[PDB]
Write a protein that binds this ligand. Structure first.
Ligand SMILES: CCCCCCCCCCCCCCCCCC(=O)OC[C@H](COP(=O)([O-])OCC[N+](C)(C)C)OC(=O)CCCCCCCCCCCCCCCCC
Ligand SMILES: CCCCCCCCCCCCCCCCCC(=O)OC[C@H](COP(=O)([O-])OCC[N+](C)(C)C)OC(=O)CCCCCCCCCCCCCCCCC
Ligand SMILES: CCCCCCCCCCCCCCCCCC(=O)OC[C@H](COP(=O)(O)OCCN)OC(=O)CCCCCCCCCCCCCCCCC
Ligand SMILES: NC(=O)C1=CN([C@@H]2O[C@H](COP(=O)(O)OP(=O)(O)OC[C@H]3O[C@@H](n4cnc5c(N)ncnc54)[C@H](OP(=O)(O)O)[C@@H]3O)[C@@H](O)[C@H]2O)C=CC1
Ligand code: SF4
Ligand code: SF4
Lengths: 317, 385, 43, 157, 178, 113, 339, 198
């Protein structure tokens, strides 16, 4: 039964991963006055499966100058961490409820920065290092504010367990309070998934990036990872800040609304991508260290003070 | 320092540029652009081809502003023949010349964004661009590479429905500029990527021979369309969009204004196009009409000789410059009395601009260079020739 | 005789100037919205 | 149906469908023909609909649409990018400049065709080969990819 | 007549109200939200793409497309080998050699348009006195092998016979203009 | 264990994918197909040579700010501490002193890439 | 015939219309290269899908290379291929007896039918290629079967040249790559510790040029040339040398062949292309025969090219980034054995 | 017949005299075409001096270099005819200063006077072979890296002497002497009858 549950979480998520790609190629399309992929299958539903098969069949290329492990470990790590981080998400009931759940999500995300570092060293191709060193920096920087923003949240939740927020948000979303950080969580979620406004990790016009020397299957796994993440981080926004209504008698309306909010915020980063030009490498770090980190550290203190003098210290457990 | 080709196949270069960089980390210290990847021998081939059979070559030098290019050869050859195009033809060349500057600017503004990372502006305008090519195809038969503007006059009369269709496109086009206007002109992300990047001082721009929006962007007031009015640019009213400071933003804003000013010129041309003939009536210079060559001997002889041998323009040499969308496009045509030219130096607004990349991209990151090439509107056909 | 020409009286007028609309909520009013959310949210 | 032959015919039909449905062309445009495809990528004739999505990294690309003249200075490169593309790979030569020398055939700086440099699968004709015309050529590549029977040949080899 | 773009006419001194409006613009990304609205708007517009095989992008009569050699209604091929179509071809594409046919008429023994050499200028359409060589409407003639693109008299005459009905209609529509 | 079960399936799923990816596809590999890759011309350098990072002082700081965060992480349990006054007095001092570290990072060329 | 006009390069004519049935091969690729360079008309019968023969298209000029669909079991396909050729070159061969084709077929059965038809057609000359040192009694079924063929084809086609090449040295060859690829294997087995099986490699091009020269020379009729090489080698130096250029450790450990023939049997089972072959193994330890015979290279006009000279290009792909820049001069040469 | 204003043919003519007078050490001929274009002709040594006077003279400011080109008249002893076309945004007029240079008698470089010429001078060396002293970095711009011969010279074959193809044997692109499959048909076009006295 546990395996059944393991399958129920991973298989559906992976399929959702696939169709996000399709949805990204139609919502971007209609925004740009074009139908998008509808000719393969009905309305393009078979389109994600089609290139998956093309990608795996095409010859994986191992560059003459390439490590053969820091090359194959990197995608495996990227897919493994991203699919793994869905293990504790408390859609209604979580699967593996962890008392220090949010620290698990923060730690697992942090490990993905290596895959970028390992793939870049493995490729030993310019246009790759230039992509990994800047990339690791972006990801790491957007971790420092990412973590502080969560610590502010937790202090108003009382615990690190993601399951507690379902009881914290039984009367109001944590967006109303703490909206200023939501925005800053959303922008940081955009950086950590290397999506558009912050896609310098792999800029195409700039260093076509970390994936240039990777093809076929090796390419797909990260690929899958990114998109699953795209969902996971959006889902964490939909639990931590937008709290779906929870009724203990019927758990699925929690998951039904979790479904609706996650899809809309997942739709939002798709919409952000088409709408904005990409930021400069230093313009990106200028935002986090200058614009956001002082806001976050100060609002972090406000969230240690709001509890005490408003006699609202949250109940542990 | 490090060296990256940042070269061919990049999605930043047009596909045909080798920009050997000397990146110190991310900052770029020196650029040594290696053009020549699309040198086709355009000017050594023209010497072996008659004046009409060399027109086509001029539609392929800057391949995004075809007709304005072929208005520079047409004006040159016409000068050397002391012949002038008929009144309707001159309006048609000005009508097609501004459709080409809207077409080049949609090319330059949207592809610049494609390089920076904004995807959607390209798709919205490119649909508006095929609407425009249709106008080329409906008047010449080729979507691009028309060959419509002939050394004397233009080749065929406008079909009977084109001016109504150009009104409907021009009527609704400005909202389309307004729409990318909102999506890419105040985005802090665009401004940051474009503002204060590649500033070029006024005297430096004149000294480097920039001569284009690059000249106007830094505040120098020079438009060959008002200063030295070629064709009818003396009977149409427009405002040159001079920018103030020179950052890649002021240059973008100028390019968006010229699209708007060109709609003002296109409006006047549709409102005031004269009834008349589209090609000069000298059979010696412009071919005879299809019915005439099939019923009058003097016309068949003139058709046979013009197509087989040529105009035989009188010996001389001229440098004729017109304001092509990129900048001053000039042809120095040296002519012996023969029907085929002796030399045809195509001055390309672009050979001068690409030279400026090293000076303009000074103290700038790898990413800034992508914007610097984008704001020169460089098409390597014109530079490589 | 019949050649493609502007309609009699000329064509109508075409707009070229930017028509970007300055439509938005005033800044003070805007601040209040977010501030109010926080103020209430905290309570 | 039941026959090791039928299973091997159906499965390539599957393998061929995947390659046919998702052809990722390479972001490599020379001269002007690249514009006449930027029009194919554009809204009147979307290419994505058919599956194709421009991807710069040769390493992640299935079709190389050579657009424009291949000068004798870009030849040594085209071959490199063709050589660095993943194995399943196809070439579409667009433009009379590329399939044959076109205007500029007799130039000293132009290779008279990309067929001299890279093996070419479909030749799309026209000075600016129209954008539908490229789309017909890409669709003709898809007809060529459907006909290929790699698994059948391995079985009866 | 000139026009300043990006030139600030004057120094508006900050007024709290102004400052707030601005600060709000930076803090709550107001202009960024403006941009998102534009793209959401189009998402709701009808896409402009055409089913390519089922629907075709419109081409009017002058479209040059693919070369064809026409024949008189009687059945006598129009070309009389004057060979000025060869003279005016910019790319040297057309190669013509002729000899008096047995009938005694002038005709071309070999007429070879190298389409890869041809840049589809349409001057040949222009130059022909009998208008035997025409730019036919078809643009879809992509070929697997380079040799197929080279065209001899028999392919062009066959191309002419296949598309004669539309070629005649197209020339019918545009001849007054020429 | 329950976590161990999930994780090994997670690695298995990824290792399964990569394996298929390398053995199913057919492969033919002349050099120049595997050679390094820099836009179509020879690299013209080692592609691993010393690469300068203009972000010299930003990098060092991140590490210091990370640690502060660390110290800021125990807060959730420390909120319930009976003292409260000392808690906040401590936490506010930590956040303020690090932020000043940042302040000096800004003031100095650090964080100015 | 076709009078030879031109300057000598592509777009010129040499007048050799030649069916070449196994062109897709490693040797083949080279044969079509020169034939195409010279300007000869080359008909390439092929069975593999068009995708795989694309590599042959750019070779040769337009209308100079013609590809025909052909099946070995179907006699009619061979019939039409040689219809209009005047030179037929046979390079049909394999190392792994495939499910539907036996060594006899690939070497003796098929290459007969082919020359047989060629005669019916009236082709001026047929060149048949069989492995060097091929006794009708040689251990490897392959070599013996090949020997069987060179006899037969002489009765189907008299005065048919029979070049008999040694194992070939070239990029994409086995002789050199096989050993270099033993890297995957931690230890590199070598029967008799790689001794007493002196081997003389021959560059592929030399072989190709030789073959081509045959097509255009009256001196070769019924000749059984033997392209051999510029220097012989005990398998030991060869193996190490290879590993030397590859810059990978060399660990020669002797392996009793009786057991090793078994290892060949193992890989030999591969459904897909077999890595090694029982018939291979024997061949590898089958000593190169001495050079007393109608000479090949030089005799046919090409001076052999030493192995060390081009080895760097063949073995480069097997090196690691660390050694990629390393050059031949840095490395040492192997030693020959006039024995 | 084109409309011609003699105002210009008079203005430009006068200026020509003015330049000539001011720079008599180098100006050999100064003509105005029937197309109202001035074309001071200077001894090659006057390259630096004549340009500088035009770039920096209050009564003749010629700030930008429109183009630098070299026609090649093989008959002429001095084969090349370097032509510099300049523009004066202040006086809205263009002038052309043309000098003569033989193959191995180099001209001075004006990169100092106008930096626009940095590239065009490299273009003239690559195509015609004229050499420019004191040039910062003269090196082929348009031709291939290993190209031998200067292409726009009238004595260079159009098709050239080398063409490129990929050779499998050597797995690398390889030059070969040009072999063309349809030579450029050299139509003779000049008519045996003249047009006017000119
Ligand atoms: C218990 C400690 C942790 C064990 C797993 C990590 C270390 C594995 C042993 C590493 C020993 C050093 C080494 O192998 O260097 C050679 C390797 C060789 O590189 P490679 O094997 O990654 O790929 C290169 C392949 N060639 C050589 C053909 C180009 O150098 C390294 O990259 C060192 C780091 C990776 C070593 C292998 C890690 C496997 C991890 C499995 C999980
Ligand atoms: C139904 C779909 C609605 C889509 C709304 C966005 C697209 C339409 C925009 C139309 C437009 O142009 O107006 C923009 C307008 C245009 O204004 P403007 O930028 O032109 O100037 C007005 C503002 N002043 C004058 C002060 C400068 O932008 C705004 O009005 C301000 C937007 C602030 C947004 C702050 C960040 C987003 C909100 C974060 C908190 C969470 C909110 C809820 C998140 C989801 C919860 C489920
Ligand atoms: C791939 C590399 C990353 C692997 C995925 C990331 C896994 C991160 C695990 C973080 C720690 C998880 C944890 O602490 O949960 C402990 C769990 C429950 O403990 P607790 O929360 O305290 O609840 C007690 C009362 N309910 O109960 C436990 O005790 C779980 C014990 C650890 C379970 C780990 C599962 C396997 C992960 C390691 C796999 C190793 C193989 C791969 C090695 C990769 C090396 C790079
Ligand atoms: N080291 C060497 O290479 C040596 C080779 N030789 C001889 O030279 C010849 C060429 O060798 P090489 O090129 O390496 O051989 P390959 O393994 O490269 O194959 C040669 C060609 O034969 C074709 N072929 C093989 N089996 C069949 C079949 N059953 N039906 C139809 N065609 C077939 C193959 O076509 P496809 O792949 O399409 O099936 C291939 O193109 C061989 O015959 C061999 O006996 C002699 C001495 C040394
Ligand atoms: S083919 Fe016609 S269009 Fe395509 S590049 Fe050559 S010239 Fe430009
Ligand atoms: S011009 Fe018309 S008629 Fe005269 S040859 Fe060419 S095609 Fe035949």
């Amino acid at each position: 039964m546990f395996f059944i549950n393991i399958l129920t979480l991973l298989v559906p998520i992976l399929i959702a991963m696939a169709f996000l790609t399709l949805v990204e190629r139609k919502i971007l399309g209609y925004m740009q006055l074009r139908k998008g992929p509808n000719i393969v299958g009905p309305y393009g539903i078979l389109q994600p499966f089609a290139d998956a098969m093309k990608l795996f069949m095409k010859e994986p290329m191992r560059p003459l100058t390439t490590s053969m492990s820091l090359f194959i470990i990197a995608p495996t790590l990227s897919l493994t961490l991203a699919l793994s981080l869905w293990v504790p998400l408390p859609m209604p009931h979580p699967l593996i409820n962890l008392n220090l759940g949010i620290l698990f999500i923060l730690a697992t995300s942090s490990l993905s920065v290596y895959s970028i570092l390992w793939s870049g060293w493995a490729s030993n191709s310019k246009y790759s290092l230039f992509g990994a060193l800047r990339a690791v920096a972006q990801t790491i920087s957007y971790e420092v504010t990412m973590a502080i923003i969560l610590l502010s949240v937790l202090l108003m939740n009382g615990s690190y367990s993601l399951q507690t927020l379902i009881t914290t948000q039984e009367h109001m979303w944590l967006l109303l309070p703490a909206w200023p950080m939501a925005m800053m969580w959303f922008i940081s979620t955009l950086a950590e998934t290397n999506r558009a406004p912050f896609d310098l990790t792999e800029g195409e016009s700039e260093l076509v990036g970390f994936n240039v020397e990777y093809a076929a299957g090796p390419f797909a796994l990260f690929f899958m990872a990114e998109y699953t993440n795209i969902i996971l981080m959006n889902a964490l926004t939909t639990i931590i800040f937008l709290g779906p209504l929870y009724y203990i008698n019927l758990p699925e309306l929690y998951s039904t609304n979790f479904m609706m909010e996650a899809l809309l915020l997942s739709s939002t980063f798709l919409w952000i991508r088409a709408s904005y030009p990409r930021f400069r490498y230093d313009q990106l770090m200028h935002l986090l260290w200058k614009n956001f980190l002082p806001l976050t550290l100060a609002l972090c203190m406000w969230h240690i003070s709001l509890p005490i003098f408003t006699a609202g210290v949250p109940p542990y457990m | 320092n490090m060296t990256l080709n940042f070269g061919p196949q990049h999605p930043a270069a047009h596909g045909v540029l080798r920009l050997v960089l000397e990146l110190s980390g991310e900052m770029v210290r020196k650029c040594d652009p290696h053009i020549g990847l699309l040198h086709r021998g355009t000017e050594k081939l023209i010497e072996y081809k008659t004046y009409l059979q060399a027109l086509p070559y001029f539609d392929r030098l800057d391949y995004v502003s075809m007709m304005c290019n072929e208005q520079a050869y047409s004006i040159a050859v016409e000068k050397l023949l002391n012949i002038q195009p008929p009144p309707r033809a001159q309006w048609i060349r000005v009508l097609f010349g501004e459709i080409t500057r809207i077409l080049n600017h949609i090319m330059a503004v949207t592809t610049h964004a494609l390089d920076i990372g904004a995807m959607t502006p390209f798709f919205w305008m490119f649909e508006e661009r095929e609407k425009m090519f249709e106008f080329y195809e409906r008047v010449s038969g080729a979507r691009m590479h028309a060959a419509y503007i002939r050394p004397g006059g233009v080749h065929q009369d406008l079909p009977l429905g084109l001016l109504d269709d150009i009104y409907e496109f021009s009527k609704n086009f400005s909202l389309r500029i307004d729409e990318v206007e909102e999506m890419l002109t105040n985005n802090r992300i665009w401004r940051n990527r474009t503002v204060d990047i590649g500033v070029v001082t006024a005297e430096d721009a004149l000294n480097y021979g920039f001569s284009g929006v690059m000249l106007r962007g830094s505040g120098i007031q020079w438009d060959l369309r008002k200063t030295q009015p070629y064709d009818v640019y003396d009977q149409v009213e427009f405002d040159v969009p001079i920018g103030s400071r020179g950052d890649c933003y002021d240059r973008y804003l100028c390019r968006v204004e010229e699209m708007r000013q060109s709609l003002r010129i296109i409006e006047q041309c549709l409102n005031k196009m004269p009834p008349g003939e589209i090609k000069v009536d000298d059979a010696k210079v412009s071919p005879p009409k299809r019915a005439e060559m099939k019923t009058s001997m003097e016309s068949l002889i003139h058709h046979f000789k013009l197509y087989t041998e040529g105009y035989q323009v009188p010996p001389g040499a001229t440098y004729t410059a017109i304001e092509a969308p990129k900048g001053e496009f000039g042809v120095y045509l040296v002519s012996d009395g023969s029907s085929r030219p002796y030399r045809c130096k195509i001055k390309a607004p672009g050979f001068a601009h690409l030279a400026g990349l090293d000076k303009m991209s000074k103290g700038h990151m790898l990413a800034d260079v992508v914007a610097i090439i984008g704001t020169q509107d460089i098409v390597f056909g014109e530079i490589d020739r | 005789v019949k050649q493609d020409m502007p309609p009699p009286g000329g064509y109508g007028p075409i707009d070229y100037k930017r028509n970007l609309p300055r439509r938005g909520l005033s800044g003070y009013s805007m601040f209040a919205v977010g501030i109010g959310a926080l103020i209430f949210g905290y309570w | 149906r039941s026959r090791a032959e039928y299973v091997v015919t159906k499965l390539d039909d599957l393998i061929n469908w995947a390659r046919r449905s998702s052809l990722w062309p390479m972001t490599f445009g020379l001269a002007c023909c690249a514009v006449e495809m930027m029009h194919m990528a554009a809204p009147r004739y979307d290419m994505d609909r058919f599956g194709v999505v421009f991807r710069a990294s040769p390493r992640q690309a299935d079709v190389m649409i050579v657009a424009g003249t291949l000068t004798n200075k870009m030849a040594p490169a085209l071959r490199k990018v063709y050589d660095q593309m993943p194995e399943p790979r196809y070439v579409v030569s667009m433009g009379s400049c590329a399939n044959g020398g076109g205007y500029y055939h007799y130039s000293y700086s132009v290779v008279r065709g990309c067929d001299r440099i890279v093996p070419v699968d479909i030749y799309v004709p026209g000075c600016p080969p129209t954008a539908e015309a490229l789309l017909y050529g890409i669709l003709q590549l898809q007809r060529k990819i459907k006909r290929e029977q790699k698994l059948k040949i391995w079985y009866r080899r | 007549t000139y026009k300043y773009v990006n030139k600030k006419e004057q120094e508006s001194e900050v007024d709290m109200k102004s400052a707030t409006d601005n600060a709000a613009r930076i803090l709550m990304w107001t202009e960024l939200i403006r941009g998102l609205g534009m793209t959401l708007s189009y998402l709701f517009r009808e896409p402009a793409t055409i089913n390519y095989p089922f629907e075709k992008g419109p081409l009017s009569p002058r479209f040059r497309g693919e070369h064809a050699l026409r024949r008189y209604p009687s059945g006598e091929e129009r070309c009389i080998a004057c060979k000025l179509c060869e003279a005016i071809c910019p790319a040297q594409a057309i190669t013509i050699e002729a000899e008096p046919r047995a009938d005694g008429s002038r005709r071309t023994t070999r007429y070879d348009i190298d389409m890869t050499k041809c840049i589809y200028c349409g001057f040949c359409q222009e130059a022909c006195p009998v208008d035997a060589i025409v730019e036919g409407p078809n643009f879809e003639f992509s070929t697997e092998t380079h040799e197929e693109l080279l065209y001899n008299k028999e392919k062009l005459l066959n191309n002419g016979d296949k598309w004669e009905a539309e070629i005649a209609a197209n020339i019918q529509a545009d001849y007054l203009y020429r | 264990m329950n976590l161990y079960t999930v994780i090994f399936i997670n690695i298995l799923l990824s290792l399964t994918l990569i394996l298929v990816a390398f053995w199913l596809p057919q492969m033919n590999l002349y050099s120049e197909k595997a050679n390094p890759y820099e836009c179509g011309f020879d690299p013209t350098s080692s592609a691993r040579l010393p690469f300068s990072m203009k972000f010299f002082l930003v990098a060092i700081t991140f590490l210091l700010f990370d640690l502060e965060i660390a110290l800021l992480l125990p807060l959730p349990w420390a909120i319930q501490t009976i003292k409260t006054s000392t808690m906040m007095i401590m936490a506010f001092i930590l956040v303020t002193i690090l932020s000043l570290g940042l302040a000096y990072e800004w003031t100095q060329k650090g964080l100015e890439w | 015939a076709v009078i030879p006009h031109g300057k000598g390069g592509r777009s010129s004519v040499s007048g050799v219309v030649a069916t070449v049935f196994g062109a897709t091969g490693f040797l083949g690729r080279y044969v079509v290269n020169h034939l195409g360079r010279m300007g000869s008309q080359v008909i390439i019968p092929y069975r593999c899908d068009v995708y795989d023969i694309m590599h042959l298209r750019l070779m040769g000029d337009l209308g100079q290379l013609t590809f025909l669909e052909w099946d070995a079991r179907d006699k009619d396909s061979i019939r039409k291929a040689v219809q209009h050729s005047n030179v037929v070159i046979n390079l049909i061969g394999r190392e792994w007896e495939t499910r539907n084709f036996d060594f006899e077929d690939v070497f003796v059965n098929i290459p007969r039918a082919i020359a047989q038809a060629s005669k019916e057609a009236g082709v001026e000359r047929f060149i048949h290629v069989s492995h060097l040192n091929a006794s009708m009694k040689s251990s490897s079924k392959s070599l013996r079967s090949k020997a069987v063929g060179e006899k037969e084809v002489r009765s189907v086609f008299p005065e048919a040249i029979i070049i008999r090449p040694s194992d070939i040295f070239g990029r994409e060859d086995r002789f050199l790559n096989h050993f270099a690829n033993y890297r995957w294997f931690l230890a590199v087995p070598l029967v008799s510790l790689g001794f007493k099986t002196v081997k003389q490699p021959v560059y592929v091009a030399d072989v190709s040029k030789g073959i081509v020269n045959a097509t255009k020379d009256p001196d070769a009729v019924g000749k059984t040339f033997a392209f051999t090489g510029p220097n012989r080698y005990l398998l030991f130096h060869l193996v190490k040398y290879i590993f030397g250029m590859t810059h990978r450790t060399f660990i020669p450990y002797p392996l009793p062949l009786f057991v090793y023939s078994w290892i060949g049997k193992l890989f030999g089972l591969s459904p897909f292309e077999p890595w090694t072959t029982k018939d291979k193994v024997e061949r590898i330890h089958i000593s190169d025969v001495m050079p007393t015979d109608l000479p090949g290279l030089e005799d046919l006009g090409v001076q052999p090219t030493p192995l060390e000279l081009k080895s760097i290009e063949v073995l480069r792909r097997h090196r690691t980034y660390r050694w990629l820049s390393s050059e031949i001069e840095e490395t040492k040469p192997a030693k020959t054995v006039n024995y | 017949v084109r409309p011609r204003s003699d105002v210009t043919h008079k203005q430009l003519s006068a200026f020509g005299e003015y330049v000539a007078e001011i720079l008599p050490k180098y100006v050999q001929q100064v003509q105005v075409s029937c197309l109202d274009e001035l074309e001071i002709c200077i001894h090659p040594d006057g390259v630096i001096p004549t340009l500088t006077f035009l770039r920096d003279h209050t009564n003749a400011q010629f700030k930008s270099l429109a183009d630098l080109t070299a026609v090649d008249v093989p008959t002429r002893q001095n084969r090349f005819e370097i032509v510099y076309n300049l523009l004066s945004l202040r006086f809205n007029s263009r002038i052309r200063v043309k000098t003569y240079a033989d193959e191995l008698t180099p001209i001075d470089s004006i990169v100092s006077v106008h930096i626009a010429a940095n590239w065009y001078e490299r273009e003239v060396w690559d195509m015609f072979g004229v050499f420019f002293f004191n040039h910062p970095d003269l090196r082929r711009i348009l031709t291939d890296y290993g190209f031998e011969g200067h292409p726009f010279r009238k004595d260079f074959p159009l098709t050239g002497y080398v063409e490129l193809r990929y050779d499998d044997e050597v797995k690398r692109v390889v030059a070969e002497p040009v072999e063309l499959a349809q030579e450029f048909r050299k139509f003779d076009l000049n008519s045996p009858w003249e047009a006017f006295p000119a």
